[PDB]
């Protein structure tokens, strides 16, 4: 976790080393109860001692809530008054053990400790490798979510005096010994106040600090980046709250009659951005309103304004990575699209609304059989279509979203496959006749569904709604499943694997898809960033030319994997963090020897140990079938599908090794070069080499216009 005794107050992660750990665990051996109770014992195991110490240090706040005291010469006891700083106190020496410990850093280790105990109290999976066998601390943009480059062409002492809005006098120098410590502390406080709710944790980096100096000089002498001090520049790192990232208002204190002290603080701090608004519900509050934009987020805009306002007029703020990524997301042909954020789903909701209207006009039509159900199952309906649904945009390959039409049960169906499908088409004909005769604003035509092998009669009704959308309708009965199992029975052993594969494809299109849609939508509304992450990942795959042989659902599940399994990392709240976590996971993944178990669950019904062991048995059985994995590369499974081969089947091992190779190339590039526009553009570049032949085709018409991008 990147923690040692290095000086945290100087603007880097730390302030907590193994010495500090040993001191505190000795203190827990000494005592530590709220009744001054001894907590651990001299004859425990390392596992017991470690669990107990983690439990205590995670549960007990030591900065704002309480403090811990003891005598080094006796019983330790926690006292429920905080000293606004991490305070373990020997009363024989009056020493705070954690004076090098920034409160923000304390919060960060508190979150890590909570994750540690959560992994430990998990009893099902192997948590050891997440606990100890990965260094999270290497990559900044993976460990944190939003880091911004902060340029300070400071200069010398008088340049500081005229450029730094903060005063540097004797009281600043006596409570913060060094200028750098003062600067980091001030920047921390100003960013914390100016952001507040929108974030989770903050960290500051003095890029360019060193600890080594010869015996030749009085001190460390630098000239780095305009300043002559022990940094090149500042980097701010943010762990950001997901659902608070796009709040167009920033509320302050309530408008009282006089000027309240906190409102005075807010208005002095904000000033030009301070305002009084009258809302809808009879409220009067101080706020600093913003504007939302696609390419750059509100955090970026506010962090520029606040730091420029309250630090220096020469400071510079950047994150070209996040701005580039947001530009790599496609943009709709909807009004005010650039102003529309990335966490706004209005196009999807418009689609769903016109579906509801259609749901009325079909569900109450007159029919042979009473309608049992209508089920959207579509990619857009689970918010994973790459291009957003634009009205009248029929250049989208996924324009016609899919909706099951299930009738009731009745045993007068034919028991023959072709006649069965032809009767289903007769149902769709009656629906189309009635819909045309009553609903003249709609339009309709029929099409041949050829996604399923060896099953040729399937016709689906495409209906066009005058909101500019298109739904394709297919029918489902129970005779489908019964007949397909009958066919696998009356197959011969030469043909049985082919009928099995066809049955799997039918299952994927007609039975698992509804559970797939239900689960992913219900979880995406909690994990807001999952939908942009998976759209970005789809863009990445389409750049790397793998979407032809990778279906949607494999991509979706491997995309949600880092969200549902953050540990040891965090839940991604920024597009760069999620995207790179997915690629990192692919690179680490060894599908020849790794299973994949997905618990599509809201944060903390989950999988029982029996189900986990059953899927693990299935995994071992398929590995015994083919340890080479030549006929089965990925084993991705969940409660909605323990068989797993349903989505992961039907792929070439060349395609899998190409994807693994591209993952490894991306990870090596990030390990080597660094995050900048050239590396991002190089990722989005294709290979176009390494083949046997390349054939390059140009359509008569450029379909961006009718695609609406």
């Amino acid at each position: 976790r990147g923690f040692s005794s290095n000086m945290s107050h100087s603007g880097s992660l730390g302030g907590f080393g193994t010495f500090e750990f040993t001191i505190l665990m000795a203190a827990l051996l000494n005592g530590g109860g709220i009744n001054s109770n001894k907590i651990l014992l001299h004859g425990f195991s390392s596992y017991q001692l470690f669990k107990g110490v983690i439990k205590y240090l995670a549960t007990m706040d030591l900065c704002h809530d309480g403090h811990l005291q003891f005598h080094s010469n006796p019983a330790s006891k926690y006292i429920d008054e905080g000293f606004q700083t991490p305070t373990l106190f020997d009363k024989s020496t009056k020493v705070n053990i954690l004076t090098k410990m920034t409160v923000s850093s304390y919060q960060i280790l508190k979150e890590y400790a909570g994750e540690t105990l959560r992994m430990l109290n998990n009893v099902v999976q192997d948590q050891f490798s997440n606990i100890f066998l990965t260094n999270i601390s290497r990559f900044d943009n993976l460990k944190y979510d939003l880091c911004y480059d902060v340029q300070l062409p400071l200069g010398k002492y008088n340049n500081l005096e005229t450029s730094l809005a903060a005063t540097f006098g004797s009281m600043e120098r006596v409570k913060f010994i060094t200028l750098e410590n003062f600067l980091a502390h001030k920047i921390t406080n100003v960013a914390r106040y100016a952001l507040g709710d929108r974030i989770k944790y903050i960290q500051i980096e003095m890029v360019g600090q060193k600890s080594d100096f010869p015996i030749t000089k009085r001190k460390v002498y630098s000239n780095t980046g305009g300043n002559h001090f022990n940094f090149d520049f500042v980097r701010v790192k943010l762990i950001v709250n997901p659902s608070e990232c796009d709040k167009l208002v920033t509320k302050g204190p309530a408008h009282s009659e006089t000027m309240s002290t906190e409102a005075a603080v807010f208005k002095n701090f904000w000033g030009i951005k301070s305002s009084l608004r009258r809302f809808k519900d009879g409220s009067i509050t101080h706020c600093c309103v913003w504007s939302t934009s696609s390419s750059e987020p509100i955090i970026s805009s506010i962090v520029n304004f606040a730091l420029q306002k309250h630090v220096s007029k020469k400071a510079q703020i950047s994150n070209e990575t996040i701005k580039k990524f947001h530009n790599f997301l496609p943009l709709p042909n909807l009004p005010s699209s650039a102003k529309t954020s990335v966490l706004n789903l209005s196009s999807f909701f418009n689609l769903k609304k016109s579906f509801d209207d259609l749901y009325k006009i079909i569900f109450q039509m007159k029919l042979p059989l009473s309608v049992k159900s209508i089920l959207p199952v579509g990619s857009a309906f689970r918010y994973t279509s790459l291009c957003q649904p634009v009205p009248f945009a029929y250049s989208d390959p996924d324009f016609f979203q899919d909706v099951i039409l299930e009738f009731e049960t009745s045993p007068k169906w034919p028991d023959e496959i072709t006649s069965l499908e032809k009767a289903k088409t007769a149902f769709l004909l009656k629906i189309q006749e009635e819909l045309s005769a009553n609903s003249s604003t709609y339009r309709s035509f029929f099409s041949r569904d050829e996604s399923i092998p060896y099953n040729l009669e399937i016709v689906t009704l495409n209906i066009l709604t005058p909101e500019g959308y298109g739904f394709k309708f297919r029918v489902l009965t129970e005779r489908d499943e019964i007949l397909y199992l009958r066919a696998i029975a009356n197959a011969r052993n030469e043909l049985k694997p082919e009928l099995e594969a066809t049955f799997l494809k039918f299952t994927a299109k007609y039975l698992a898809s509804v559970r797939h849609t239900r689960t992913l939508e219900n979880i995406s509304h909690s994990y807001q960033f999952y939908s942009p992450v998976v759209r970005l990942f789809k863009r990445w795959l389409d750049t790397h030319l793998l979407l032809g042989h990778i279906t949607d659902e494999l991509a979706e599940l491997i995309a949600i994997k880092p969200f549902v399994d953050p540990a040891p990392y965090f839940i991604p709240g920024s597009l760069e963090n999620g995207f790179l976590k997915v690629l990192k996971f692919i690179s680490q993944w060894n599908w020849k020897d790794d299973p994949l178990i997905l618990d599509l669950v809201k944060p903390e019904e989950r999988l029982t140990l029996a189900q986990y062991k059953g899927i693990q048995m299935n995994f071992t059985n398929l590995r015994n079938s083919d340890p080479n994995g030549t006929h089965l590369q990925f084993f991705v499974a969940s409660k909605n599908d323990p068989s797993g081969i349903l989505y992961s089947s039907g792929i070439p091992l060349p395609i899998a090794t190409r994807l693994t190779a591209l993952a490894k190339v991306a990870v090596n590039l990030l390990q080597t070069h660094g995050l900048n526009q050239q590396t991002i553009n190089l990722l989005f570049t294709p290979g176009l080499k390494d083949y046997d032949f390349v054939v390059d085709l140009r359509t008569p018409i450029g379909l961006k216009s009718s695609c609406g991008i």
Binding site: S45, S46, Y47, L120, D126, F128, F132
Partner: peptide, 26 residues
């Protein structure tokens, strides 16, 4: 958790364990 955990930490401590010859050299 206990049994596999002891096995895993045993493997870890064995992998990271230091050399007595180097210790006495220092």
């Amino acid at each position: 958790k206990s049994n596999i955990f002891k096995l895993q930490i045993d493997e870890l401590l064995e992998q990271v364990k230091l050399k007595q010859k180097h210790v006495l050299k220092v």
